[PDB]
């Protein structure tokens, strides 16, 4: 029908006038919210203008996924098991530059936008690193306009918000979906049967999967806008329902239920986690298939399709792949298994054999009966390969296969990503390099070229245009807006250091975020700080490894130095410390009990004055990381030497304006490369001294003999100076430390406080240390997702990056 | 602030403009469903369109609520477990004005309006007539003016959908909310605890109710728009959610997640505990609601400011749940919360016999909602003080007052709660309304004749001529305007053309083109001939014994047996049509399903038998089917047993729509036969004195069976397996019956319901006198207005009055 042409996109968002953006409003308010002005709640007014914000955003989205379907680009598919995406509101503004006129439009109708900012809940779907990282790539994906989708499941309840009781850490049920989600649209239509259980039939066809029980996935799809290109792309999330059913019992209730709570809640061997993973994958490959389809010839599917592993979460993926082509699609085995290896790859984050994952085979042999039948055929075919390049070598076979013998029958799932995808990189330079020289041997030895690196990095918008419009505003005055797209080049600012103006600026800037970070700690939690002293921040997940108990050794070192001699002048320094335990882990709870009680000593002794404040930083996450990075002075990146594959933290710092304590592990080898370990403060044990200690043997006790300042604080630990109610409160803290501390925090302390001495000296010298700031922002370029993702999609993916502004969206 | 005065509905989307709405519908499709043209299914294009009409409807709505907010009328408060709300989209745009203009913007944009309103659901939210009732009020006190809010359970699943399967009803489920309601609007902010189970502590200040298991009740808002007047009220029904809990003891806690959630599950139908729960679950969320409103104090202007309708005994524990907020939670002496209370609420009575009324036995009431047992204690107790007072010495009087009944199992009759705890109790139809004095009721009247009271039922004139029978509004409408569409008793005009050829020609002519439209949608799915020229015969009601479509079914092969015997006598063609839901374990209604298709079976296939009849039986009887083959009616079946019906209010839809009635003399029948003259109305049958009569000496069905050789040969044939050649007993449940335990009369009224059934057939013959008589039917038919009843409640009942004022906006 020509009339149909009609019904078209083009006339509809206009533009972005104030006049524009006030009539939407009003409009949502009203017609979409149902509220009007008597009865709007702050809530009310967020959600408008969320909803306002949205509708710019789906008009350029609608046009991105017609160019997508106009030029078949390769697809290419992002799985991950959590996305840790914060706040939306603010990030679409910049993105799609509708900052200004907002602000205008908000103010003209009389409400602060960023009170409307502060209402947004951060997105429950994510936890550490590994989510944060998902984000940033999504982001860069969008604004190097290739046709990429972010795939996982919807959780309702996402991991604990903390709360923190008397020292205490507490856990409340993060209700971020209690008044929905005006980001997302839910996709009935695009419901699909997910299968469990059962059992398998060898008949003459092949093997069908027969007497099966159903879950419904039903996807939510939300928009990820790129920088000012106008390419949005997808992230589809799944979320579980179980079918309606009219039988003489009703015991099948507990089906409703299990079937429900696979969208319920993150983690943490539950049966449980491996339905979440086989659940994801299941949808998401059915999803991917039947787009496929709509361009039946599977040979060009590897030129169409790539689907990242994040870790190896959805390892099942490689299985599953292979059941529907063999099982379903009537392929033959071989060519099937060449499709799959050449559309998959897989990227570790783990440093330790340990945290790698494995699952007992009584577990999938009574959930996914055809996958384990599938994996043992996988895995007799790949030891054929492994005893023709090895011939003889017996102990190869069983070191190389997917299936591990011990006390309990397992399956490794690290093994079957590795046999099943055409690439593997590490998240790290030394990282990768851990990977084939000890973890992953066997295989690199097997297949050399299979093996990669790509360093991670972080997306220079929410993490410096967003977060520290300050300092991307200073810069962009000397080079222009280009760098936010091409990070590189803040190399630039290698010739300002010496041009006084840009110093001052630099620290202005800095000061500054102090200022309104020192304000929004006050207008929450009543707690005094000096904004001019040094900004300490340790924000990290809490546990041994990271090493935040060697952050509070050198506090009360600080303390009692202060107490020696209260005339000394000493740089003053707030100490902040933030980051969730995991419920389970005795020693995180207890380090964080010790954090506060530190805290009630310190910052309420007389003596001490305002010289030195130590503040635990509660409910760490995405939104909160935004406050506290501009704000910092020094960065602690302090984990054992070898514990840490990359870390992310790191270079959001960096970027910011904050130096870096850290030692010789993750990335930070790396960021030390491009600042130059003159401009970087490294200290302790390497990854070789740790090596040689394990050898030798490590006793706590022979620094403890030495050291009359360790000494001193497990004494004032042990007798309660910290604890006077309960003297013996902290006594596994101090066991641990002294027996059986398998991270070496004694070891590594001597040198630590000389270096915290060497910055403290720095510290005194706002000029020199301004210019090393600035040596450090300049160098942060390496470290942009846009530089991670350029190397994805031509080394690993097979497509080209483009920085085009696509037309739309009133064109 | 002066800033803040810039968040205004006024100038958003104002008009009916052809343009706008084509700007409204592209904004709905890709910036609302995030679909495209390209992507588009016509059931997106009906969401689009849905969203276009919407933002229209809910500026009214707005500014409807903005004018309750300071005018502070008295409040009418309609409770009922169903609303048979039908489809939306039509009755909407009839009722704003913007159907023309919806129908050219479609148009233009290469799309057509009957598709899109094709796709929409049936609201999952009712069952039969006590359902339909509550919509058609809801549409007529908005029409009224009145301002009125309806309360009720957002069933996820309704009543199931019929499927018919080898003769037999099967029943699938109903996910109307499959693709969402974009009628509703979630309400999370004013979500509502409710409480269950517990215990009762007695403290020297008040009683407590404490260590209760809670349920939280979350409302969803619809709005039902007035007649062109611009008022749009509001739907607000409850769902229920579990409280997230997030450990040691144990997770039988995930069956309180699934108890809990089945209360909003399914509509019914044992005497479940779940039923129970339903009730105090709608009534207790509601009752929270309204004290709410009412404080955005003392509660003396209460019975002024507030009205409670009590539809059935389904919403009774609000008599005793008031007391609970009133006494407990507010600290009003039972006197003063007693007199708010039986001046508040009214009670309106839908059933005729003693053993339909709603009892529940304490031992349940004692379990689940301790504190109202002790408040109906309470209650009990003084009334009977009354009774002993006004009635000394009569002993006997008190047990049978008592709304403790004492059975086999100790029992609370709630409908004797209804009548102590509220000043007026209705009736539904005058004979019925009389019948609660007379027998089932008279002590209470003995007592309280100032209470009872009639409301004969009505029907809104909008969803059933106006939506369904454009044809015949038009016509209408050309002779003496549009005022009579708010306004039903102007139809009385009509009388005047009685003798007006073209009048006359025109009325056959929508008929007949009503008959046209649904042959076509007939001949589709069940792949059969329909003769447009036969006879359109139409039953359509629950499947029950009393309701009598044996009756009918007898009839069906009587003519059949008469075509056999004497093919080439002329014979007016019918076809026979049959509808309705059978309550799923009814096992009586699942075979009288399978007897009309097996019927169907042979007549349908009999090449003897040609054209001249045929047995359909309607498949999932509903609302927007009901608006199809209405319209397309000749006669209309009323026939149960007389004395079994209050009311029946689809008898009132026949006959506003060209119909002619054959009925027996019962419910709705004697009003209309009343209003249109008896000789334009064909009656047969015992009356309710005649059934009487009939208990009195015995019925024995052996002395019908004996006396007519017709009535013979059909059970010959139902026994000897006719019917079911592969199963020759599987109707023998159905003549035994028939035979031995028939009680409702089948037999008693076959002679008299046949010899009617001729006198329908001989004047069909006459187009022109068969005419005169349906339009004297229409003419004579506006007292069914369901503006009229509504009328009779806001004056008699309410104390408030109806206004046809319009409202602006902006």
Redesign the interface.
């Known amino acids: 029908?020509?009339?149909?042409?009609?019904?078209?996109?083009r006339?509809?968002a206009g533009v972005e006038n104030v006049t524009e953006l006030?009539?939407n409003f009003?409009?949502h308010?009203?017609?979409t919210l149902?509220k009007?002005?008597?009865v709007?709640?702050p809530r009310d007014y967020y959600f408008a203008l969320a909803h306002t914000v949205?509708?710019h955003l789906?008009?350029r989205?609608?046009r991105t996924q017609?160019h997508y379907?106009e030029k078949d680009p390769k697809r290419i598919y992002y799985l991950s098991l959590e996305f840790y995406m914060g706040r939306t509101l603010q990030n679409t503004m910049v993105n799609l530059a509708l900052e200004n006129a907002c602000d205008e439009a908000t103010y003209?109708?009389?409400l602060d936008m960023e009170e409307l900012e502060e209402i947004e809940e951060d997105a429950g779907l994510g936890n550490g690193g590994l989510g944060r990282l998902a984000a940033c790539f999504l982001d860069s994906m969008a604004t190097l306009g290739l046709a990429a989708y972010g795939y996982g499941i919807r959780y309702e309840?996402g991991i604990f918000n903390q709360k923190i009781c008397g020292g205490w850490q507490m856990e409340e049920?993060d209700?971020w979906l209690?008044?929905?989600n005006p980001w997302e649209?839910?996709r009935?239509?695009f419901t699909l049967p997910v299968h469990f259980y059962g059992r398998v039939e060898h008949t003459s066809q092949g093997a069908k999967w027969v007497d099966t029980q159903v879950v419904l996935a039903m996807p939510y799809?939300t928009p990820v806008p790129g920088y000012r290109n106008n390419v949005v792309n997808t992230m589809r999330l799944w979320s579980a329902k179980a079918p309606?059913?009219?039988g003489g019992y009703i015991q099948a209730?507990?089906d409703?239920?299990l079937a429900e709570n696979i969208s319920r809640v993150l983690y943490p061997g539950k049966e449980l986690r491996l339905k979440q993973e086989y659940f994801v994958v299941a949808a998401t490959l059915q999803d991917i298939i039947r787009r496929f389809k709509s361009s039946t010839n599977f040979d060009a599917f590897p030129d169409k399709v790539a689907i990242q592993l994040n870790d190896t979460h959805p390892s099942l993926a490689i299985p599953e792949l292979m059941r529907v082509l063999v099982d379903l699609e009537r392929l033959d085995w071989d060519k099937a298994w060449e499709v799959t290896v050449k559309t998959c790859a897989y990227t570790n984050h783990t440093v330790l054999p340990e945290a790698l994952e494995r699952w007992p085979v009584h577990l999938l042999e009574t959930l996914l009966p055809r996958h384990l039948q599938i994996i043992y055929e996988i895995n007799q075919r790949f030891l054929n390969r492994v005893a023709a390049a090895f011939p003889g070598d017996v102990d190869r076979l069983r070191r190389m296969s997917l299936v591990e013998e011990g006390a309990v029958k397992r399956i490794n799932m690290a093994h079957l990503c590795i046999a099943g995808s055409h690439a593997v990189n590490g998240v790290a330079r030394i990282h990768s390099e851990i990977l084939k020289k000890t973890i992953f041997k066997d295989f690199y030895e097997l297949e050399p070229h299979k093996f990669q690196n790509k360093t991670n990095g972080i997306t220079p918008r929410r993490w410096l245009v967003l977060c520290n419009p300050g300092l991307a505003e200073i810069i962009a005055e000397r080079i222009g807006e280009e760098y936010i797209s091409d990070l590189d080049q803040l190399r630039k600012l290698l010739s300002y250091v010496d041009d006084e103006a840009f110093i001052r600026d630099v620290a202005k800037v800095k000061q500054e975020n102090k200022l309104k970070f020192a304000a929004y700690l006050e207008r929450e939690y009543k707690v005094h700080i000096n904004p001019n002293s040094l900004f300490d921040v340790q924000v990290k997940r809490i546990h041994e490894y990271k090493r935040q108990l060697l952050n509070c050794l050198h506090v009360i070192t600080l303390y009692n130095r202060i107490k020696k001699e209260p005339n000394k002048f000493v740089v003053p320094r707030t100490v902040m410390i933030g980051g969730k335990a995991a419920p389970g882990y005795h020693m995180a709870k207890m380090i964080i009990k010790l954090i506060t009680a530190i805290g009630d000593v310190v910052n309420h002794d007389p003596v001490v004055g305002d010289r030195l404040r130590v503040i635990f930083l509660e409910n760490y996450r995405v939104s909160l990381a935004e406050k506290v990075i501009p704000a910092a002075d020094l960065s602690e990146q302090i984990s054992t030497a070898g514990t840490e594959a990359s870390g992310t933290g790191n270079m959001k710092f960096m970027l910011n304006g904050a130096l870096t304590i850290g030692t010789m592990d993750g990335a930070n080898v790396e960021m030390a490369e491009e600042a130059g370990e003159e401009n970087f403060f490294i200290f302790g044990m390497r990854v070789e001294d740790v090596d040689r200690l394990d050898q030798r043997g490590y006793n706590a006790q022979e620094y403890y003999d030495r050291i009359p300042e360790l000494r001193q604080i497990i004494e004032q630990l042990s007798s309660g100076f910290f604890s006077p109610k309960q003297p013996d409160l902290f006594k596994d803290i101090v066991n641990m430390l002294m027996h059986h501390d398998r991270f070496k925090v004694f070891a590594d302390y001597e040198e630590y406080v000389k270096c915290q001495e060497r910055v403290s000296a720095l510290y005194k010298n706002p000029r020199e240390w301004t210019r090393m700031v600035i040596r450090n922002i300049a160098t942060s370029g390496k470290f942009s997702s846009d530089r991670t993702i350029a190397q994805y999609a031509r080394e690993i993916w097979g497509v080209e990056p483009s920085r085009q502004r696509l037309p739309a969206p009133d064109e």
Not at 1 to 9: D, F, G, T
């Open positions: 029908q020509e009339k149909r042409k009609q019904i078209s996109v006339g509809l006030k009539k009003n409009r308010l009203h017609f149902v009007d002005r008597n709007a709640t949205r509708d789906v008009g989205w609608i017609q379907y003209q109708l009389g309840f049920a209700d209690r008044y929905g649209k839910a009935p239509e799809d309606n059913d009219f209730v507990l409703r239920n």
